[PDB]
Design a protein around this ligand. Sequence first.
Ligand SMILES: *[C@@H]1O[C@H](CO)[C@@H](O[C@@H]2O[C@H](CO)[C@@H](O)[C@H](O)[C@H]2NC(C)=O)[C@H](O)[C@H]1NC(C)=O
Ligand SMILES: *[C@@H]1O[C@H](CO)[C@@H](O[C@@H]2O[C@H](CO)[C@@H](O)[C@H](O)[C@H]2NC(C)=O)[C@H](O)[C@H]1NC(C)=O
Ligand SMILES: *[C@@H]1O[C@H](CO)[C@@H](O[C@@H]2O[C@H](CO)[C@@H](O)[C@H](O)[C@H]2NC(C)=O)[C@H](O)[C@H]1NC(C)=O
Ligand SMILES: *[C@@H]1O[C@H](CO)[C@@H](O[C@@H]2O[C@H](CO)[C@@H](O)[C@H](O)[C@H]2NC(C)=O)[C@H](O)[C@H]1NC(C)=O
Ligand SMILES: *[C@@H]1O[C@H](CO)[C@@H](O[C@@H]2O[C@H](CO)[C@@H](O)[C@H](O)[C@H]2NC(C)=O)[C@H](O)[C@H]1NC(C)=O
Ligand SMILES: *[C@@H]1O[C@H](CO)[C@@H](O[C@@H]2O[C@H](CO)[C@@H](O)[C@H](O)[C@H]2NC(C)=O)[C@H](O)[C@H]1NC(C)=O
Ligand SMILES: *[C@@H]1O[C@H](CO)[C@@H](O)[C@H](O)[C@H]1NC(C)=O
Ligand SMILES: *[C@@H]1O[C@H](CO)[C@@H](O)[C@H](O)[C@H]1NC(C)=O
Ligand SMILES: *[C@@H]1O[C@H](CO)[C@@H](O)[C@H](O)[C@H]1NC(C)=O
Ligand SMILES: *[C@@H]1O[C@H](CO)[C@@H](O)[C@H](O)[C@H]1NC(C)=O
Ligand SMILES: *[C@@H]1O[C@H](CO)[C@@H](O)[C@H](O)[C@H]1NC(C)=O
Ligand SMILES: *[C@@H]1O[C@H](CO)[C@@H](O)[C@H](O)[C@H]1NC(C)=O
Ligand SMILES: *[C@@H]1O[C@H](CO)[C@@H](O)[C@H](O)[C@H]1NC(C)=O
Ligand SMILES: *[C@@H]1O[C@H](CO)[C@@H](O)[C@H](O)[C@H]1NC(C)=O
Ligand SMILES: *[C@@H]1O[C@H](CO)[C@@H](O)[C@H](O)[C@H]1NC(C)=O
Lengths: 197, 562, 329, 131
Amino acid sequence: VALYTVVHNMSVCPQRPESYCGSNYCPFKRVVFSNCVVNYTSWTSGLLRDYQHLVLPNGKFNPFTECNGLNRIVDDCVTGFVLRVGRGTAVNRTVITPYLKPNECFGWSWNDYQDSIYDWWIADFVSTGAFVCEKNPDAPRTGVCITYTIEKVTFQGVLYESNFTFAQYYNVLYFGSQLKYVRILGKVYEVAPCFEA
Amino acid sequence: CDYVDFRLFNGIFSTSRGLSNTTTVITGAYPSTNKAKWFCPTNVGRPVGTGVGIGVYAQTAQASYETGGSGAGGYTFSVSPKHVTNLTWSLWVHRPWGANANVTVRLCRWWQGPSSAFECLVNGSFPSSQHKGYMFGVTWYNDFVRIIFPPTVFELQLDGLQWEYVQFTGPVNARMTKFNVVTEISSVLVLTDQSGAVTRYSYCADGFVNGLQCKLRLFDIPPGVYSNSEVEYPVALYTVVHNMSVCPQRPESYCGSNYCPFKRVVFSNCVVNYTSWTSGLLRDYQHLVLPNGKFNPFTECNGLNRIVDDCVTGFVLRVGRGTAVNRTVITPYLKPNECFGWSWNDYQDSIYDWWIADFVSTGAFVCEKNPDAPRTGVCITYTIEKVTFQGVLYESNFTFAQYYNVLYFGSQLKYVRILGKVYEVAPCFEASYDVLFRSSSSFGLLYRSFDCNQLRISASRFAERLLPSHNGTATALGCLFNATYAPNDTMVNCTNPLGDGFCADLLSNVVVRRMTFEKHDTTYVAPVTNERFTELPLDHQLVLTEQFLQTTMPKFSISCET
Amino acid sequence: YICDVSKACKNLLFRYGGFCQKIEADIRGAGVLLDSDVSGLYSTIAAKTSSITPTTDRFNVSQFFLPKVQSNSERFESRSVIEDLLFSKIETTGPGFYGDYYNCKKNAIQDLTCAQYHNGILVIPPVMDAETLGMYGGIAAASLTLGIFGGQAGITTWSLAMAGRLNALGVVQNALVDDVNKLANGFNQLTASVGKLALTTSSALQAIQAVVNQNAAQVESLVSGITENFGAISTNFKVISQRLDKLEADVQMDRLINGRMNVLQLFVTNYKLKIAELRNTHRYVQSLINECVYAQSLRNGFCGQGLHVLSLMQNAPSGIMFFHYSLIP
Amino acid sequence: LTTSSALQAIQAVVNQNAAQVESLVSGITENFGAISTNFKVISQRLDKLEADVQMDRLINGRMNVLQLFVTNYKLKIAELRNTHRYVQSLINECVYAQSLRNGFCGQGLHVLSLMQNAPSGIMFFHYSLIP
Ligand SMILES: *[C@@H]1O[C@H](CO)[C@@H](O[C@@H]2O[C@H](CO)[C@@H](O)[C@H](O)[C@H]2NC(C)=O)[C@H](O)[C@H]1NC(C)=O
Ligand SMILES: *[C@@H]1O[C@H](CO)[C@@H](O[C@@H]2O[C@H](CO)[C@@H](O)[C@H](O)[C@H]2NC(C)=O)[C@H](O)[C@H]1NC(C)=O
Ligand SMILES: *[C@@H]1O[C@H](CO)[C@@H](O[C@@H]2O[C@H](CO)[C@@H](O)[C@H](O)[C@H]2NC(C)=O)[C@H](O)[C@H]1NC(C)=O
Ligand SMILES: *[C@@H]1O[C@H](CO)[C@@H](O[C@@H]2O[C@H](CO)[C@@H](O)[C@H](O)[C@H]2NC(C)=O)[C@H](O)[C@H]1NC(C)=O
Ligand SMILES: *[C@@H]1O[C@H](CO)[C@@H](O[C@@H]2O[C@H](CO)[C@@H](O)[C@H](O)[C@H]2NC(C)=O)[C@H](O)[C@H]1NC(C)=O
Ligand SMILES: *[C@@H]1O[C@H](CO)[C@@H](O[C@@H]2O[C@H](CO)[C@@H](O)[C@H](O)[C@H]2NC(C)=O)[C@H](O)[C@H]1NC(C)=O
Ligand SMILES: *[C@@H]1O[C@H](CO)[C@@H](O)[C@H](O)[C@H]1NC(C)=O
Ligand SMILES: *[C@@H]1O[C@H](CO)[C@@H](O)[C@H](O)[C@H]1NC(C)=O
Ligand SMILES: *[C@@H]1O[C@H](CO)[C@@H](O)[C@H](O)[C@H]1NC(C)=O
Ligand SMILES: *[C@@H]1O[C@H](CO)[C@@H](O)[C@H](O)[C@H]1NC(C)=O
Ligand SMILES: *[C@@H]1O[C@H](CO)[C@@H](O)[C@H](O)[C@H]1NC(C)=O
Ligand SMILES: *[C@@H]1O[C@H](CO)[C@@H](O)[C@H](O)[C@H]1NC(C)=O
Ligand SMILES: *[C@@H]1O[C@H](CO)[C@@H](O)[C@H](O)[C@H]1NC(C)=O
Ligand SMILES: *[C@@H]1O[C@H](CO)[C@@H](O)[C@H](O)[C@H]1NC(C)=O
Ligand SMILES: *[C@@H]1O[C@H](CO)[C@@H](O)[C@H](O)[C@H]1NC(C)=O
């Protein structure tokens, strides 16, 4: 198998909004994450003792501790989200999960551990059509039969490099109801049937 | 506007997938093909145009070979709700004067296009096309923002946005950037080329023939008989049909001397004033005002829509009182089918009232107004007692039992009761018609379920329903309009059958004739038992008759897990 | 039928794997097969008469099988006396849309349309529609004489035609006037006994009622498919999206769309199942017209048991009734 | 094609076969309301309750299309059982013999009948003398 959540290159994501509210009470700072490549461990300070609770058993950083309607474990690509940040104080080392609306995920790491100060972030996954991944896609292996998934549609077949051109707004091209051409990383591939299945 | 380039519409149409040489219907918020809906006046200054709707589109003028040089056009425009406060989101889009200019797009909350805002979701600058004519747009139908500067499309759903009001300016050069505010959702038939790009469109509602083009997925319609074109009629919802009295008051939140449980009151079968649940001073409830200026009782729901659109089911309401630390009211744990809201009680001391509404099964409804009497004698798609039906209401002297609001005969809805008065439900027979089509300038109409005798269409019963096309010929096939009806002529060669032994002759003009069949003979000869006359043939015609019979199919093997 | 005026529902229909394209291709192709069969039937029915009409002497065939002559009233009737009795002995199915449809076909009022439209569904007549025609009149008239007078005309009377038929069946060598009158009395008593057929005793009236009862049960299914809510809070789509949140509005709209898809799909399957039966029923019907009605057959038991004298045919509700006359010992 | 009712009967079979094939092609292209047609995608992005709701939407959507194909295929087989008995009677009695049955090999006095293969079936050519 070969999944493509996206087929083009994405640029990097913005930074996490800063949690320090200046002099008074202020509302939170929202930033849209969409169509970009994200480094989730940039959202912490970087010292291991601040984010140990976010490390998965396989040694991987995970941004979230609790979700409503989604999987808290992030497997390399999610949809686009709106991210808001804030800051609190834990009593007896216990961060309380707040009320989560549907399609929201919560996470936190220590900011000033001795003073029990933490940053938190809530990601609200709204309809965007775009995706946030942790890496860019690769070029396909041509000339072998693979079960692909491209543009939410699964098909079994063989890709060959092609000199065909179709319009730049599309990433797949149909002839009637038959998938004939796809575009991956700017290059166009003819979809051929694997007759020996 | 004087000239809108309608060949630039091809670049803003797209399908979901890439389709080679196909013909398909797409649907969405699209620019009007009526040139009077566009805005491009030349004057001494830059004129400010406004509009109300769901979107906007724009075309820049042809820059190459126009004696312009470098000045192009700025097209500053903003989109906003009906009541702009500190708390509402708005859009601001600006291009500066000159070529190689960057469009700036800003979706922010401004306290005052201003420089400083509280926060922004889109704060972006990017290059644009100026070497040719260029078309772009921004739509916000059902709060789904779509920013279409081709080739890229930026999309974002933002609930409760409620954008409706559009303002736009443009500096006159030499012309001006043209503007069209979109008011409604359209269907468009499109034709693609080999590469999937749209090369031919046609809007489904620009005319009579255009609707038939979209029904058949064809641009060039050959002559024929095309059945079941339908007429759309407006809607009328009745969540209730009787008058309700007023609701009780909100329970008071002041607990007397000690700790006490909350006070519950049932709201059911009544008319509610939600802004009575606050103190009435605006600074206490500003967070409950929607962007359209409307009061909304709730800030958070579990399983329901927090925006209340004029009627909900009955609920049990409990109140209470708390203290906010650093002006932050915390939403508590909400059981399913519950909604939460709050307003300030003593703002300086940070004291607030709250209320939780638990929508339990009651069978009854809480509305913000009483229903109205129906408009009789027009075909409306009604919804009454959770059942949707299309039809016509007439006042009636019929009586049925007071426990019921609808009355069925078998499975047919015959009578309803609205505000104590009983109405007969009648069918609107003119909702469906066929087209007896020669070309775009010669067609006839057949209303197959409509008996249009002159007594019926002249009555006061049919006064509000009479269109000019209902004055046709009453046939056994229905009402035939602007076709001639000739049931004494015959045709043995019928290419266009209508049913019931009728045929449509579509050669010169639209005529309805009768079908016939060629009479055959038999080979059985009766025996000759006495002297009489008999009829013998003189010669014979040799005849070839063909007969097809299907005998085979391919076999299938199915792996249903695969 | 699914999404009555709701534009929000129509934007959701593309998700289902070509449902609405496949429905409209199946119901249209089935009517093409229906029109192809009914057209072949009426080119078989249409047949030449003699230019001199023979006289029925004592055989009362014109009073029963031939269209009723227009009386002193401007109410034209195309049906015979037998064809009227077959429409009027079929029981009603009660109030509703189909009972309104049957009574329009039964009453046969001139220039009155019987087509109905409900909820996106048009009821169109077929290419000929037997239910408004008399068998032995009209443009596509059947021959009354072709199977006992034959295809070479000249036999002057029904008494001379029946005498030759009794001779060819080997029961009388040369039929006298008492032999032919005995056959004319037995014909007229049997034909008058058709007007006393009850539904409880007649297996031909029972076969018509079974068709009429299956049509009403199918119509109630389409009426119930847009009346009930399948578990959603309303049949109004805009109501559903306004009162619920996004997850529960998408669950309940999926309940309405699938509930209406299942009822509509079941109608198309039953309609295709009835077309497929009628392909080989029509070939059987064309053989009865060609070999029993318009000729004299040699096949034992094919036109009834016994020695075959005459066969006639009449229109019925949704079909044709064959009247076979035989001599059994 | 516009004038020949035998060519029209062949085209009706060929048009019904294409419409059935598009139904099987569309049944694995569309997502029936789920977020993807990839099952591993669905279980990775959603929680346990919503992953089981959306997988049930794909499985039932594909089950309905596949089941409809088998029903239509069985409906066509059941028609062809009694069509074959009619076809065997035309070969035995019109093509390989001389029949006595009025109108069974066409109307009129029967001279000759021949048969040819067609797309998905057989075409009979009946030659007759009518006066
Ligand atoms: C993702 O973010 C982490 C956290 O900042 C980056 O790790 C740091 O990278 C810099 C390189 O400029 C090093 O000097 C630091 O020692 C790294 N660790 C910490 C804790 O700051 C990392 O480079 C980013 N990118 C990737 C691909 O992981
Ligand atoms: C909308 O926001 C403006 C600016 O944030 C508010 O104006 C301030 O009002 C306070 C009094 O409430 C003054 O002390 C400040 O000097 C004002 N200006 C600024 C720049 O802060 C305004 O009151 C708000 N309006 C509403 C209705 O909330
Ligand atoms: C939106 O973007 C503009 C720049 O594209 C921001 O303007 C800058 O803001 C910073 C911080 O206040 C100033 O130091 C710069 O002088 C500004 N101008 C520039 C870079 O030309 C603007 O602040 C952004 N808006 C928000 C709400 O962040
Ligand atoms: C709904 O409740 C509001 C809030 O009390 C009512 O508004 C007040 O009406 C009285 C009339 O007796 C006025 O004197 C007040 O000035 C109004 N405003 C406030 C803030 O108290 C309103 O009348 C009620 N009814 C409707 C239909 O809105
Ligand atoms: C429908 O059309 C008919 C035919 O034009 C109208 O009947 C004519 O009405 C006029 C009144 O202006 C009379 O003077 C004529 O004698 C009528 N008969 C003809 C012209 O043959 C009828 O009025 C129209 N009805 C409606 C409701 O539009
Ligand atoms: C067959 O038709 C003849 C027509 O001549 C019928 O005979 C007449 O019937 C009417 C109706 O009852 C009587 O009033 C006449 O007295 C009859 N006349 C003669 C000469 O018979 C006859 O009744 C018909 N037979 C059947 C069984 O319907
Ligand atoms: C916190 O810890 C102290 C002692 O460590 C304990 O007495 C107290 O109950 C804990 N909880 C809170 C909410 O203070
Ligand atoms: C594509 O174009 C190049 C350049 O002419 C050619 O060498 C090659 O054969 C073409 N086809 C493919 C499949 O690469
Ligand atoms: C996509 O990203 C990779 C990252 O290394 C880069 O090397 C490549 O040039 C980019 N563009 C294309 C078209 O692959
Ligand atoms: C305009 O955009 C280009 C490309 O994004 C950028 O290099 C340039 O600095 C921008 N100039 C201004 C004035 O915004
Ligand atoms: C369809 O595309 C083909 C090439 O794939 C080309 O002949 C032409 O552009 C189109 N032809 C027709 C008949 O639409
Ligand atoms: C409230 O505000 C003060 C200063 O304004 C701040 O120090 C404190 O962390 C805030 N939060 C709480 C829970 O007290
Ligand atoms: C109802 O009754 C009144 C009073 O007799 C009468 O005038 C009217 O015609 C009746 N029918 C309708 C439909 O109002
Ligand atoms: C219903 O309420 C309206 C409110 O103005 C009132 O005028 C009317 O009399 C009431 N009753 C009926 C039967 O409409
Ligand atoms: C029957 O009509 C069609 C179309 O009008 C025509 O092409 C054909 O030649 C006609 N045939 C006869 C025999 O009239």
